[PDB]
Design an enzyme around this catalytic site. Sequence first.
Site, PDB file in Angstrom:
ATOM      1  N   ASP A   1      40.345  40.991  18.519  1.00 52.47           N
ATOM      2  CA  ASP A   1      39.829  39.632  18.619  1.00 52.47           C
ATOM      3  C   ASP A   1      40.256  39.006  19.945  1.00 52.47           C
ATOM      4  OD1 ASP A   1      39.007  36.996  18.211  1.00 52.47           O
ATOM      5  OD2 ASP A   1      40.001  36.845  16.239  1.00 52.47           O
ATOM      6  N   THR A   2      39.405  39.153  20.955  1.00 55.11           N
ATOM      7  CA  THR A   2      39.701  38.592  22.274  1.00 55.11           C
ATOM      8  C   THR A   2      39.695  37.050  22.290  1.00 55.11           C
ATOM      9  OG1 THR A   2      37.387  38.746  23.003  1.00 55.11           O
ATOM     10  CG2 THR A   2      38.846  40.651  23.467  1.00 55.11           C
ATOM     11  N   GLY A   3      39.082  36.429  21.286  1.00 58.93           N
ATOM     12  CA  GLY A   3      39.099  34.965  21.145  1.00 58.93           C
ATOM     13  C   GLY A   3      40.341  34.412  20.474  1.00 58.93           C
TER      14      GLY A   3
HETATM   15  C1  MUU Z   1      46.404  30.011  18.289  1.00 59.58           C
HETATM   16  N1  MUU Z   1      44.985  30.015  17.976  1.00 59.58           N
HETATM   17  C2  MUU Z   1      44.218  31.089  18.172  1.00 59.58           C
HETATM   18  O1  MUU Z   1      44.668  32.154  18.613  1.00 59.58           O
HETATM   19  C3  MUU Z   1      42.754  30.963  17.835  1.00 59.58           C
HETATM   20  C4  MUU Z   1      42.421  32.012  16.801  1.00 59.58           C
HETATM   21  C5  MUU Z   1      40.962  31.934  16.462  1.00 59.58           C
HETATM   22  O2  MUU Z   1      40.670  31.399  15.408  1.00 59.58           O
HETATM   23  N2  MUU Z   1      40.050  32.471  17.282  1.00 59.58           N
HETATM   24  C6  MUU Z   1      38.602  32.450  17.019  1.00 59.58           C
HETATM   25  C7  MUU Z   1      37.882  31.793  18.199  1.00 59.58           C
HETATM   26  C8  MUU Z   1      38.467  30.421  18.426  1.00 59.58           C
HETATM   27  C9  MUU Z   1      38.151  29.372  17.579  1.00 59.58           C
HETATM   28  C10 MUU Z   1      38.722  28.129  17.783  1.00 59.58           C
HETATM   29  C11 MUU Z   1      39.579  27.901  18.836  1.00 59.58           C
HETATM   30  C12 MUU Z   1      39.906  28.946  19.689  1.00 59.58           C
HETATM   31  C13 MUU Z   1      39.349  30.196  19.482  1.00 59.58           C
HETATM   32  C14 MUU Z   1      38.101  33.879  16.735  1.00 59.58           C
HETATM   33  O3  MUU Z   1      38.176  34.655  17.930  1.00 59.58           O
HETATM   34  C15 MUU Z   1      36.667  33.954  16.155  1.00 59.58           C
HETATM   35  N3  MUU Z   1      36.736  33.397  14.783  1.00 59.58           N
HETATM   36  C16 MUU Z   1      36.670  34.437  13.732  1.00 59.58           C
HETATM   37  C17 MUU Z   1      38.023  35.153  13.687  1.00 59.58           C
HETATM   38  C18 MUU Z   1      38.595  35.509  12.314  1.00 59.58           C
HETATM   39  C19 MUU Z   1      39.197  34.359  13.109  1.00 59.58           C
HETATM   40  S1  MUU Z   1      35.761  32.124  14.503  1.00 59.58           S
HETATM   41  O4  MUU Z   1      35.803  31.278  15.656  1.00 59.58           O
HETATM   42  O5  MUU Z   1      36.275  31.475  13.330  1.00 59.58           O
HETATM   43  C20 MUU Z   1      34.186  32.551  14.201  1.00 59.58           C
HETATM   44  C21 MUU Z   1      33.256  32.649  15.237  1.00 59.58           C
HETATM   45  C22 MUU Z   1      31.936  33.016  14.968  1.00 59.58           C
HETATM   46  C23 MUU Z   1      31.541  33.277  13.664  1.00 59.58           C
HETATM   47  C24 MUU Z   1      32.469  33.192  12.619  1.00 59.58           C
HETATM   48  O6  MUU Z   1      32.138  33.441  11.301  1.00 59.58           O
HETATM   49  C25 MUU Z   1      30.929  34.071  10.896  1.00 59.58           C
HETATM   50  C26 MUU Z   1      33.781  32.825  12.898  1.00 59.58           C
END
Ligand code: MUU
EC number: 3.4.23.16
Lengths: 99, 99
Positions: A25-27
């Site tokens: 998960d790069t996000g």
């Molecule tokens: C300290 N916080 C973190 O590391 C953020 C973790 C995180 O939830 N990353 C998410 C992106 C994000 C969201 C909000 C703010 C910053 C980044 C993550 O990479 C993508 N997420 C899913 C991952 C299981 C968690 S998600 O954003 O919830 C997402 C996106 C698109 C469709 C989805 O469902 C169908 C869900």
Amino acid sequence: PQITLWKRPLVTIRIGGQLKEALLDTGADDTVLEEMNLPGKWKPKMIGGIGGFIKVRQYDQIPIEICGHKAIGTVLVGPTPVNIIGRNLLTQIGCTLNF
Amino acid sequence: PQITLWKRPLVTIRIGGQLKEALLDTGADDTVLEEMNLPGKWKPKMIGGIGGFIKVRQYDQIPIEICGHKAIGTVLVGPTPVNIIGRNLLTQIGCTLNF
Ligand SMILES: CNC(=O)CCC(=O)N[C@@H](Cc1ccccc1)[C@H](O)CN(CC1CC1)S(=O)(=O)c1cccc(OC)c1
């Protein structure tokens, strides 16, 4: 490996002697695993995602083997929808994005 | 290009007439953009992550340019804290994970 993205980049990890499936998960800044037991000290922390904030337990300096590659770093345990490997460990195993 | 993960993989995208910074996110099935009043038909949708769910508007066949690469597909619009480029568009611009 080179991993394409037509499917979820799910990989097997080994942590605390147990095998789990986790999402590359790069996000994610941080590595967050679903409720589980890990040994040693932890500290309460809070992290934010797309739907708001959650409470997690922060375990420091935890070894995980991610798709055959060793990392040792911070692992957060709490109500994530799925086990995610974040940038803190993706960097350790030499993971880059390429296009 | 090759993008390391020491920092968030934010890149410039173009959608409508707006340039925005967005995360290249292998952990996201879908592309989710911050609130913006796009033209056209949409359908309501709920997407879930850390913290819970947000309500979004699903717009189909929206052209988007990501780092000078052309893409076109489904974009979810709602109160996300960050612009997210998900796997539906990452495949289109030839993005892979490598380690
Ligand atoms: C300290 N916080 C973190 O590391 C953020 C973790 C995180 O939830 N990353 C998410 C992106 C994000 C969201 C909000 C703010 C910053 C980044 C993550 O990479 C993508 N997420 C899913 C991952 C299981 C968690 S998600 O954003 O919830 C997402 C996106 C698109 C469709 C989805 O469902 C169908 C869900």
